[PDB]
Amino acid sequence: PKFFYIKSELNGKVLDIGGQNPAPGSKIITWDQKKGPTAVNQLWYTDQQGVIRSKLNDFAIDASHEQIETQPFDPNNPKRAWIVSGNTIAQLSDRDNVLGVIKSDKGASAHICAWKQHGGPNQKFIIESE
Ligand SMILES: OC[C@H]1O[C@@H](O[C@H]2[C@H](O)[C@@H](O)[C@H](O)O[C@@H]2CO)[C@H](O)[C@@H](O)[C@H]1O
Numbered sequence: 001p002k003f004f005y006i007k008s009e010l011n012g013k014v015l016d017i018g019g020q021n022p023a024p025g026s027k028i029i030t031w032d033q034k035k036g037p038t039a040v041n042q043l044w045y046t047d048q049q050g051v052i053r054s055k056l057n058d059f060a061i062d063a064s065h066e067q068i069e070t071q072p073f074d075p076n077n078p079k080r081a082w083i084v085s086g087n088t089i090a091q092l093s094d095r096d097n098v099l100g101v102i103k104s105d106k107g108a109s110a111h112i113c114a115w116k117q118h119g120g121p122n123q124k125f126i127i128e129s130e
Pocket of ligand 1: 017018019020031034041109
């Protein structure tokens with residue numbers, strides 16, 4: 001029941017499941033922080049292991065494709081176990097691999113990818129209580 005927002009230190013927006021799409025494989029973007037029962041697609045929590053999940057469907061963050069998207073949690077899939085570590089959303093099995101915001105080149109909402117930690121604010125996040 002302890003949910004939170006993940007805000008980018010790059011654009012000050014927050015991780016958000018694209019268009020509130022509940023289906024697995026939905027792209028995760030950054031969007032203006034909403035408030036109320038409509039913020040569900042922007043709310044996250046950590047399971048007992050500390051692995052990040054979405055309040056919307058309990059799905060985990062998955063970095064199997066070009067951009068991060070939601071996918072059912074699988075303890076056997078290394079690209080679906082992401083945890084909070086200070087200012088970074090780190091891959092549980094490889095802390096050197098962290099999430100980072102990447103602005104759009106087409107004037108759309110920014111997307112997210114996972115790559116080597118390079119110290120930029122694009123790879124820093126702030127956990128913000130609900
Ligand atoms: O565009 C991302 C943005 O979508 C909001 O939801 C919209 C969707 O964008 C729009 O195309 C559709 O017609 O209506 C949806 C309901 O508002 C999300 O609420 C927002 O968080 C972003 O994900």
